[PDB]
């Protein structure tokens, strides 16, 4: 390199010109972005208490719905197990006749 470097350098000047053009377009860095916000919060806010209790109860309701569906699945699987175990208990009564012969 170090020869005919104009082809590479003039590109940077063109980029500077396009940077100025874009700053004119919408702006490069927004002037004085969020310098001051002095609004003092309320002591607590009735609506903030309502939102806190709302979160508390909504999380609870969602968890409760999920747990209720889980418990329903549990009881259904449990009744299926009860029936299957009744039939397995008939089979095991046959096996118990065999085990009594064995004893």
């Amino acid at each position: 390199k170090s020869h005919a470097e104009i082809a590479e350098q003039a590109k940077h000047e063109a980029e500077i010109e396009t940077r100025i053009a874009e700053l004119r377009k919408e702006g490069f860095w927004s002037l004085k972005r969020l310098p001051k916000v002095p609004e003092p919060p309320r002591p607590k806010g009735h609506w903030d208490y309502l939102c806190e209790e709302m979160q508390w109860l909504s999380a609870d309701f969602a968890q409760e719905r999920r747990w209720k569906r889980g418990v329903a699945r549990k009881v259904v699987r449990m009744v299926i197990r009860h029936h299957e175990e009744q039939r397995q208990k008939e089979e095991r009564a046959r096996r118990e006749e065999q085990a009594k012969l064995r004893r």
């Binding site: 208490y49 939102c51 309701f61």
Partner: protein
Amino acid sequence: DEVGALVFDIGSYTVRAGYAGEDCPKVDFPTAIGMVVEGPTYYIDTNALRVPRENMEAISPLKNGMVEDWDSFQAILDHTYKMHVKSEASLHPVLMSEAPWNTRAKREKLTELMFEHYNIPAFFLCKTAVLTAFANGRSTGLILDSGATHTTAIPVHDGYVLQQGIVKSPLAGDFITMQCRELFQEMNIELVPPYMIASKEAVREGSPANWKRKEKLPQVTRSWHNYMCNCVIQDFQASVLQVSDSTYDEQVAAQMPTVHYEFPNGYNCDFGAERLKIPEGLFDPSNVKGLSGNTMLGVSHVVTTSVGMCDIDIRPGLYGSVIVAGGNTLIQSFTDRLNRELSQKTPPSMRLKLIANNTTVERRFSSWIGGSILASLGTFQQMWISKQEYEEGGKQCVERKCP
């Protein structure tokens, strides 16, 4: 905190009534109740409405999410009170939902109608968007409700609705029903409701239906016949329709597996790209026959417009809390298409986030669940409209206690 109450979610399609604190409403019936002018008799039970008799012209007590027939409204309220509720209204406070665009005249007339006729102990009229935000775990956010009549994006900030940001589009369940009607008519499919069918025999795919018409037919109106046809069409929608993942491409639409569906009369056929071209109108109404007009805003367009009309300081929060609800939202792949379009439109800085509630109970009953958890809070006890408040301040009290 939890007191015996009755949360009423009077939707344009179905009305959900139940006790505050429950995970699901006690009763859910279609809102297009059949009516016969005998006073007029109304039927507020699925087993008492979809029946082959009793002309029962569908009056649709409400329209556009607002009350339009106060007599039919009183009738449906009475029936809901003593058919499934079965309790005196004077013993249970009432928290009822309302459309955000509901006028003050309605609000006040409804308020006074529940104190001089039912004599309820307390009252409250909350907006559907507020209840939806309340249920999904957000006090600030955008509520996208794609109901039967209209699809609306309602921005909620700090538990209050921003009216200026409300955007509505008629592309709703009615549009889907119309498109299904057009599709059936184009494919030479006779839409025969169940009440007209005496018996049917299995036929090959695509062959004419072999069904027998009942001799002793009911004396139905055009309205009730159209209602039965619309019920069949909604069943077809729930069974077949699917939203396209990306923008509708006919070439890609012809590469998707078909869906089989049998009409009540026995006619059955597989649907290819026609079931994915109808739901495209919701997102892109440009490619819709008979809908020649670009003013109609799609779901993503409605969302972006609703968020654009709000202050920029809250738009980040709105995009960070975009709650999707409604029956139409249950269509397959609707959520994916909506999220993709919003991510493509939503600016990078704005963190787009879609709440992950998509269950039928969670979606269609979001508005009711919101009021159910709102009336079960001890903090909400101080916001009720008491009978004394109405008697002293009058019907206009609805505007101060529940703006």
